[PDB]
RNA sequence: UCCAUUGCGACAACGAGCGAGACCCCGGCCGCGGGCGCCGCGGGACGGCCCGCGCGAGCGGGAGGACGGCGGGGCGAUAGCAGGUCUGUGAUGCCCUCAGACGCCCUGGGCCGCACGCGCGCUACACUGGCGGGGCCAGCCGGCGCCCGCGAGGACGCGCGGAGCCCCCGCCGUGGCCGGGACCGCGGGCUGGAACGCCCCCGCGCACCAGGAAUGUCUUGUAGGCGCCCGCCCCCACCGCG
């Protein structure tokens, strides 16, 4: 029936985020419709001495790690408590891309 | 700080560590020094850069 | 070192500060004050009561400073 | 319109299990040394946990009948607190080992405990890589090769790349630690392959006729 | 304002609690001069007492002058409150008072003599002349 | 409207109308306070209350729909603490006083609340207009 | 607080609906963090920033910087349509350049005779460039040797 | 013209002409604007401030002291007041007078080591028109400056008198005694 | 010739490679798509055009253009130093300690003590200013209502949200003065098992008038001025990354 279901995806490199989502959009023109939201890039931060000891020039590190997010919940009615599964196990099991699904 | 469930569930005895006190340390050297507590880490600014490529952090800008 | 006034006592305002102003096509508050050796504010006051009657004009005014023109001639 | 302290949780449910798998590594790097362990990866499907391995031989690993496997599955699980039978494995073959950096260094590490001298064995160990299709590999040895007064000396034989973000797909790098009597013996390894995967290196033009 | 003249009465420079005061200055800042009080107490005396403030100390004719006097004696009657005074729970009777000239210094120095035959950390180290606060020695503060 | 006049003469002129009008009063406790830790010494006009007040109802009926918070206005009043020999840092202002001539004014109608913090009604639109109007000229 | 490339503003929801279909014209300007829209339409001459006119911008000197081109051109055209400005970014005077570079590339806008546009850029960019091409400079970043992105700390050599 | 731009709204700027033919070309004063403010970056080639309008090219320079770096309007503010109180004074337009004063003041003449042989060994050489005028505004400004400075008047009454005295040619002011001063050393040199 | 062993053109040398560049991130202009929240994929600039030169590589000027000639960062060759780190680690060789312990746990004190020499910073020496009132705009990003209390803070209850300089009006009027805010004397609170720690109120009101011999940093959104966030953290930033 109709349960408003929504789908986040998260992950830390540019390439499969993209790539699970055109198959996604590919597997779920028909249960409804799954239309995109690109979310701010939540930005982690370290800044980190390169030294062991504190010894020499005052030199830092620079790392970050970047945590992109897309989010369909345009299922919404079109996909009942079967029907999410069909695709999301159509889908590549790509390795790493955390999945969520909630009314 | 326990770190995770499993390290803990709540003559001498009377007073072997009766001093409670906040004992955070690193989740890989386990140094009371230098510890990121941001994101929930917890992790020595040494014991970091090892780990840091595998973790997912990258040099970059 | 120099000290100046700030209340003229009596005869002293129209007996010369009056005279004086009055004999000059322009005017500012830090000039008088610097001219007969008396405080800045006694100046406001003064061409307060002197706009008034008329015989002075603004130019230019700001809170920083005003100049004035003597409209008598 | 929206909140900032709900989202902290896929943002930080992420962070979590990223941080899990580093500790697997270490873990597996310290136990599967014989298997020729190299890497590892996870899914965190919601119903059980699933990791793939790449290991030379996984039927060492893999042990008579799945028995080290099992072993294996159920102790995580304790660690991690999940319910065992939801903690499965799966292995993966690597089949060009002298494309990869960790065979190498862990089979010099075995053939330097055996009292073999360096010069042998680096030599081999390139030997090996160039059979295999690559363009360079660099060995290095420091400590206290000698009585006393430890010296590193190198040994090479093609063109490596050294400077650039090439060199964090092309260049296939790592270390070890080997304790010995007289002390501990740093070693290192570097391979370089060009033509790897699909991608193309810069500065690299063919042209036609 | 608007006094531009002197009046009749103006006072080039007046004596009160035994310090001398000019009649050129405004009057809320000329009676900073006096040793007990500042801004902020004269401002909330001087309008109790139905003074102008913005005025200049010369045109201060004696019945404003006495007026004044009567308020910083008894001054918490006067509606003035108690946490914007010098002395508020004194160590023998327990009430509160502002204590202008000549009462501080004879104050200060019985505390001292308390401090002293008590024999606490901060007399022994007033005595030597030493920091009482924890404000650390030894780097700077030197010839 | 309020915004096709300047801000300065609007204030004043509408604070003496208040003032005239006994709509609101200052109470015992402006005879010595401040309005801000932030602050030094006290105002040196006796008739501050009024323009803090006029300042308020312009400030609720440029929100509108909005609401307004008592804090959020205070730190429309902020200001810099300054004589500490070390860097200065920005403060906010005082919440009793503001309290209280919001207080005043919604027990006047002029002022509506809400689901969180106040607003302004229609009769306070009606007022502030006419009066701008009237200015206008 | 506002943030200048928000959805909120560029298609400029503020207006109401059946009034945000009468204006045909839009615009942008820019200056540092700045920006400006602006929705230009036909009227009998009228000007507004966030809801304000033009003669009561605040800076007060600047006023003739952005009465500029109006004074340029001459305000016939000004005078035959009527325009409604919002702007959000860094600071009052980036407000007033990108809002006086808005204006200026609106009403290029409303003259559809590609001549007449042509000639009046040329009119208008002599007296000055940066009313129709946007100023390119932007904060630099900084390093960590020092409290700035070139200036260093002192360095003690004994 | 059409638009005369008229400066602050009051002087205009279509009869003033400068003399000195040396340093005409190093003058802009048909493009003033009303405002002397313009986020244009000169300074980015080796002679594009040449066209700068010369009063830009003064206020500039009355924000120079580490405490007072960044602030324009008060500049501005601080040249229209002075400029008020010279039509007062004088009857004319003060432009002309500004443009005098960068005129009558700047070297002709300076001194600079080329000699070597272990001591000044300075020789006497020219100076370029540039250079002039760039010295003939610092000039005026220090001036101004070192006068105001613990003194009850204000910047502006000395801003105005020194640009006077300068344009009337009168050793009084700082700009002419620098520029007599250098000039003197030089000849020495020569 | 080139910022560059960057290239041209020759030569008992011929032919290769590393480094340099290329490469990766950010920003600026345009397009497509999508869109809770502005974010994904591409185009664009190349010493290309004109003029001068130069065999040549390449130099100077003018254009048109969002941008014009290495725009800001990351990576970082061979060889080496008796440079620092055994007090970052289930990294370690050889020594020393090992039941009145140098192991581990508890209570107190100390690391901060002060006649003295010097290193990085902060605050000021005033009118191009200080005080009081009002108006107003940011970005890394971001939480608020009501009621008490002068304030700092506190009791309850819900998910909602941004500043200094600057501008306008007034007071002060060259006085170590309303500049400056160290030191000290009564009092009210917060963290915590525990104040020696940190905040607020009244009074007192130190040196200091632009700094000798000597010396550091800097070329466009740069210096300088102004403030705001994170880190370590029970409380606390004159520090550090931005």
Same mark, same amino acid.
Not at chain 3, 10 to 22: G, H, R, T, V
Not at chain 4, 172 to 191: D, F, L, S, W, Y
Not at chain 5, 63 to 89: Q, Y
Not at chain 8, 97 to 126: F, M
């Given at each position: 029936?109709?349960?408003?279901?929504?789908?986040?995806?998260?992950?830390?490199?540019?390439?499969?985020?993209?790539?699970?989502?055109?198959?996604?959009?590919?597997?779920?023109?028909?249960?409804?419709?799954?239309?995109?939201?690109?979310?701010?890039?939540?930005?982690?931060?370290?800044?980190?001495?390169?030294?062991?000891?504190?010894?020499?020039?005052?030199?830092?590190?620079?790392?970050?790690?970047?945590?992109?997010?897309?989010?369909?919940?345009?299922?919404?009615?079109?996909?009942?408590?079967?029907?999410?599964?069909?695709?999301?196990?159509?889908?590549?099991?790509?390795?790493?891309?955390?999945?969520?699904?909630?009314? | &700080?326990?770190?995770?469930?499993?390290?803990?569930?709540?003559?001498?005895?009377? &007073?072997?560590?009766?001093?409670?006190?906040?004992?955070?340390?690193?989740?890989?050297?386990?140094?009371?020094?230098?510890?990121?507590?941001?994101?929930?880490?917890?992790?020595?600014?040494?014991?970091?850069?090892?780990?840091?490529?595998?973790?997912?952090?990258?040099?970059?800008? | 070192?120099?000290?100046?006034?700030?209340?003229?006592?009596?005869?002293?305002?129209?007996?010369?500060?009056?005279?004086?102003?009055?004999?000059?096509?322009?005017?500012?508050?830090?000039?008088?004050?610097?001219?007969?050796?008396?405080?800045?504010?006694?100046?406001?006051?003064?061409?307060?009561?002197?706009?008034?009657?008329?015989?002075?004009?603004?130019?230019?005014?700001?809170?920083?400073?005003?100049?004035?023109?003597?409209?008598?001639? | 319109?929206? +909140?900032?302290?709900?989202?902290?949780?896929?943002?930080?449910?992420?962070?979590?299990?990223?941080?899990?798998?580093?500790?697997?590594?270490?873990?597996?790097?310290?136990?599967?040394?014989?298997?020729?362990?190299?890497?590892?990866?996870?899914?965190?499907?919601?119903?059980?946990?699933?990791?793939?391995?790449?290991?030379?031989?996984?039927?060492?690993?893999?042990?008579?009948?799945?028995?080290?496997?099992?072993?294996?599955?159920?102790?995580?699980?304790?660690?991690?607190?999940?319910?065992?039978?939801?903690?499965?494995?799966?292995?993966?073959?690597?089949?060009? +080992?002298?494309?990869?950096?960790?065979?190498?260094?862990?089979?010099?590490?075995?053939?330097?405990?055996?009292?073999?001298?360096? +010069?042998?064995?680096?030599?081999?160990?390139?030997?090996?890589?160039?059979?295999?299709?690559?363009?360079?590999?660099?060995?290095?040895?420091?400590?206290?090769?000698?009585?006393? +007064?430890?010296?590193?000396?190198?040994?090479?034989?093609?063109?490596?790349?050294?400077?650039?973000?090439?060199?964090?797909?092309?260049?296939?790098?790592?270390?070890?630690?080997?304790?010995?009597?007289?002390?501990?013996?740093?070693?290192?390894?570097?391979?370089?392959?060009?033509?790897?995967?699909?991608?193309?290196?810069?500065?690299?033009?063919?042209?036609?006729? | 304002?608007?006094?531009?003249?002197?009046?009749?009465?103006?006072?080039?420079?007046?004596?009160?609690?035994?310090?001398?005061?000019?009649?050129?200055?405004?009057?809320?800042?000329?009676?900073?001069?006096?040793?007990?009080?500042?801004?902020?107490?004269?401002?909330?005396?001087?309008?109790?007492?139905?003074?102008?403030?913005?005025?200049?100390?010369?045109?201060?004719?004696?019945?404003?002058?006495?007026?004044?006097?009567?308020?910083?004696?008894?001054?918490?009657?006067?509606?003035?409150?108690?946490?914007?005074?010098? =002395?508020?729970?004194?160590?023998?009777?327990?009430?509160?008072?502002?204590?202008?000239?000549?009462?501080?210094?004879?104050?200060?120095?019985?505390?001292?003599?308390?401090?002293?035959?008590?024999?606490?950390?901060?007399?022994?180290?007033?005595?030597?002349?030493?920091?009482?606060?924890?404000?650390?020695?030894?780097?700077?503060? =030197?010839? | $409207?309020?915004?096709?006049?300047?801000?300065?003469?609007?204030?004043? %002129?509408?604070?003496?109308?208040?003032?005239?009008?006994?709509?609101?009063?200052?109470?015992?406790?402006?005879?010595?306070?401040?309005?801000?830790? %932030?602050?030094?010494?006290?105002?040196?006009?006796?008739?501050?209350?009024?323009?803090?007040?006029?300042?308020?109802?312009?400030?609720?009926?440029? %929100?509108?729909?909005?609401?307004?918070?008592?804090?959020?206005?205070?730190?429309?009043? $902020? %200001?810099?603490?300054?004589?500490?020999?070390? *860097?200065?840092?920005?403060?906010?202002?005082?919440?009793?006083?503001?309290? $209280?001539?919001? $207080?005043?004014?919604?027990?006047?109608?002029?002022?509506?609340?809400?689901?969180?913090?106040?607003?302004?009604? *229609?009769?306070?639109?009606?007022?502030?207009?006419?009066?701008?109007?009237?200015?206008?000229? | 607080?506002?943030?200048?490339?928000?959805?909120?503003l560029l298609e400029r929801n503020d207006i109401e609906?059946?009034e945000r279909d009468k204006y045909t014209v839009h615009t942008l300007?820019?200056?540092?963090?700045?920006?400006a829209v602006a929705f230009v339409k036909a009227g009998?001459?009228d000007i507004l920033v966030?809801?304000?006119?033009?003669?009561?911008?605040?800076?007060?000197?600047?006023?003739?910087?952005?009465?500029?081109?109006?004074?340029?051109?001459?305000?016939?055209?000004?005078?035959?349509l009527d325009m409604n400005i919002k702007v959000?970014?860094?600071?009052?005077?980036?407000?007033?350049?990108?809002?006086?570079?808005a204006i200026?590339r609106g009403?290029?806008a409303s003259?559809?005779?590609?001549?007449?546009?042509?000639?009046?850029?040329?009119?208008?960019?002599?007296?000055?460039?940066?009313?129709?091409?946007?100023?390119?400079?932007?904060?630099?970043?900084?390093?960590?040797?020092?409290?700035?992105?070139?200036?260093?700390?002192?360095?003690?050599?004994? | 013209?059409?638009?005369?731009?008229?400066?602050?709204?009051?002087?205009?700027?279509?009869?003033?002409?400068?003399?000195?033919?040396?340093?005409?070309?190093?003058?802009?004063?048909?493009?003033?604007?009303?405002?002397?403010?313009?986020?244009?970056?000169?300074?980015?080639?080796?002679?594009?401030?040449?066209?700068?309008?010369?009063?830009?090219?003064?206020?500039?320079?009355?924000?120079?002291?580490?405490?007072?770096?960044?602030?324009?309007?008060?500049?501005?503010?601080?040249?229209?007041?002075?400029?008020?109180? /010279?039509?007062?004074?004088?009857?004319?337009?003060?432009?002309?007078?500004?443009?005098?004063?960068?005129?009558?003041?700047?070297?002709?003449?300076?001194?600079?080591?080329?000699?070597?042989?272990?001591?000044?060994?300075?020789?006497?050489?020219?100076?370029?028109?540039?250079?002039?005028?760039?010295?003939?505004?610092?000039?005026?400004?220090?001036?101004?400056?070192?006068?105001?400075?613990?003194?009850?008047?204000?910047?502006?009454?000395?801003?105005?008198?020194? /640009?006077?005295?300068?344009?009337?040619?009168?050793?009084?002011?700082?700009?002419?005694?620098?520029?007599?001063?250098?000039?003197? /050393?030089?000849?020495?040199?020569?």
């Open positions: 029936m109709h349960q408003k279901y929504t789908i986040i995806v998260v992950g830390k490199d540019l390439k499969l985020v993209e790539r699970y989502v055109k198959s996604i959009v590919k597997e779920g023109r028909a249960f409804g419709i799954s239309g995109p939201c690109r979310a701010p890039v939540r930005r982690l931060t370290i800044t980190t001495r390169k030294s062991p000891c504190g010894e020499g020039t005052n030199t830092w590190h620079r790392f970050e790690l970047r945590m992109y997010k897309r989010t369909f919940w345009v299922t919404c009615g079109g996909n009942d408590i079967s029907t999410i599964l069909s695709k999301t196990v159509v889908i590549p099991g790509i390795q790493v891309t955390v999945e969520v699904e909630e009314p | &700080e326990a770190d995770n469930i499993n390290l803990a569930s709540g003559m001498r005895e009377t &007073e072997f560590c009766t001093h409670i006190a906040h004992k955070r340390e690193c989740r890989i050297c386990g140094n009371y020094n230098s510890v990121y507590r941001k994101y929930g880490l917890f992790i020595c600014r040494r014991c970091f850069k090892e780990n840091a490529g595998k973790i997912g952090f990258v040099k970059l800008h | 070192k120099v000290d100046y006034p700030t209340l003229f006592a009596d005869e002293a305002a129209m007996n010369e500060a009056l005279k004086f102003i009055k004999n000059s096509k322009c005017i500012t508050h830090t000039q008088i004050c610097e001219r007969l050796r008396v405080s800045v504010a006694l100046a406001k006051r003064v061409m307060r009561q002197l706009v008034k009657s008329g015989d002075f004009a603004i130019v230019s005014k700001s809170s920083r400073m005003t100049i004035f023109k003597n409209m008598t001639k | 319109i929206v +909140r900032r302290d709900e989202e902290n949780v896929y943002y930080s449910k992420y962070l979590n299990d990223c941080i899990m798998e580093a500790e697997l590594h270490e873990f597996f790097s310290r136990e599967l040394v014989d298997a020729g362990y190299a890497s590892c990866s996870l899914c965190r499907t919601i119903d059980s946990i699933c990791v793939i391995i790449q290991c030379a031989e996984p039927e060492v690993v893999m042990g008579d009948n799945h028995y080290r496997l099992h072993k294996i599955e159920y102790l995580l699980a304790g660690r991690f607190m999940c319910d065992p039978k939801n903690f499965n494995i799966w292995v993966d073959k690597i089949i060009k +080992r002298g494309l990869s950096a960790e065979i190498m260094v862990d089979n010099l590490r075995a053939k330097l405990e055996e009292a073999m001298p360096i +010069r042998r064995a680096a030599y081999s160990i390139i030997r090996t890589a160039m059979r295999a299709g690559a363009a360079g590999c660099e060995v290095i040895v420091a400590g206290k090769l000698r009585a006393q +007064r430890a010296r590193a000396n190198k040994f090479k034989e093609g063109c490596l790349i050294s400077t650039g973000h090439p060199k964090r797909i092309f260049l296939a790098e790592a270390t070890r630690h080997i304790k010995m009597r007289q002390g501990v013996i740093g070693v290192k390894v570097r391979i370089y392959n060009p033509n790897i995967r699909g991608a193309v290196m810069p500065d690299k033009i063919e042209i036609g006729a | 304002m608007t006094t531009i003249v002197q009046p009749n009465d103006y006072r080039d420079l007046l004596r009160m609690f035994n310090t001398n005061i000019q009649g050129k200055v405004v009057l809320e800042c000329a009676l900073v001069g006096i040793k007990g009080i500042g801004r902020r107490f004269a401002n909330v005396a001087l309008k109790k007492a139905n003074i102008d403030v913005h005025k200049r100390a010369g045109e201060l004719t004696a019945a404003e002058e006495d007026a004044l006097m009567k308020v910083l004696e008894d001054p918490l009657s006067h509606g003035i409150p108690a946490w914007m005074l010098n =002395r508020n729970n004194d160590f023998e009777s327990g009430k509160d008072m502002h204590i202008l000239v000549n009462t501080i210094a004879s104050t200060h120095r019985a505390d001292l003599e308390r401090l002293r035959k008590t024999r606490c950390e901060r007399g022994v180290r007033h005595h030597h002349n030493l920091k009482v606060r924890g404000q650390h020695t030894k780097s700077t503060g =030197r010839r | $409207s309020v915004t096709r006049v300047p801000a300065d003469v609007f204030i004043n %002129s509408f604070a003496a109308h208040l003032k005239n009008r006994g709509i609101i009063k200052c109470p015992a406790f402006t005879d010595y306070v401040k309005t801000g830790v %932030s602050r030094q010494y006290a105002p040196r006009d006796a008739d501050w209350f009024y323009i803090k007040a006029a300042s308020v109802i312009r400030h609720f009926y440029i %929100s509108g729909s909005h609401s307004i918070g008592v804090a959020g206005l205070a730190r429309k009043y $902020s %200001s810099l603490q300054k004589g500490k020999t070390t *860097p200065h840092h920005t403060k906010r202002a005082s919440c009793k006083v503001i309290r $209280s001539i919001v $207080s005043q004014f919604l027990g006047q109608k002029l002022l509506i609340a809400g689901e969180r913090g106040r607003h302004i009604s *229609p009769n306070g639109r009606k007022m502030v207009e006419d009066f701008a109007e009237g200015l206008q000229k | 607080m506002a943030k200048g490339n928000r959805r909120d609906v059946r300007g820019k200056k540092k963090n700045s920006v009998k001459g966030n809801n304000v006119p033009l003669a009561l911008v605040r800076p007060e000197i600047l006023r003739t910087k952005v009465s500029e081109p109006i004074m340029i051109l001459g305000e016939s055209l000004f005078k035959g959000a970014g860094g600071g009052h005077v980036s407000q007033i350049y990108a809002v006086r570079q200026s009403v290029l003259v559809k005779d590609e001549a007449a546009r042509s000639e009046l850029r040329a009119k208008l960019v002599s007296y000055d460039r940066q009313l129709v091409v946007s100023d390119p400079r932007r904060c630099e970043a900084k390093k960590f040797g020092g409290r700035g992105a070139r200036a260093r700390r002192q360095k003690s050599y004994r | 013209m059409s638009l005369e731009v008229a400066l602050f709204n009051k002087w205009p700027l279509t009869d003033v002409k400068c003399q000195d033919e040396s340093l005409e070309a190093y003058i802009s004063i048909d493009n003033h604007s009303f405002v002397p403010h313009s986020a244009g970056r000169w300074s980015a080639k080796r002679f594009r401030k040449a066209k700068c309008p010369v009063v830009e090219r003064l206020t500039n320079s009355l924000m120079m002291h580490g405490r007072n770096s960044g602030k324009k309007l008060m500049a501005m503010k601080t040249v229209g007041e002075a400029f008020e109180l /010279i039509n007062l004074y004088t009857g004319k337009n003060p432009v002309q007078v500004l443009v005098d004063a960068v005129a009558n003041s700047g070297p002709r003449e300076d001194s600079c080591r080329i000699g070597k042989g272990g001591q000044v060994r300075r020789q006497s050489v020219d100076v370029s028109p540039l250079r002039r005028v760039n010295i003939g505004i610092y000039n005026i400004a220090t001036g101004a400056r070192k006068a105001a400075f613990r003194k009850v008047r204000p910047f502006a009454e000395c801003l105005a008198e020194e /640009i006077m005295n300068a344009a009337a040619g009168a050793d009084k002011s700082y700009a002419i005694s620098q520029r007599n001063s250098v000039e003197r /050393i030089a000849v020495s040199n020569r």
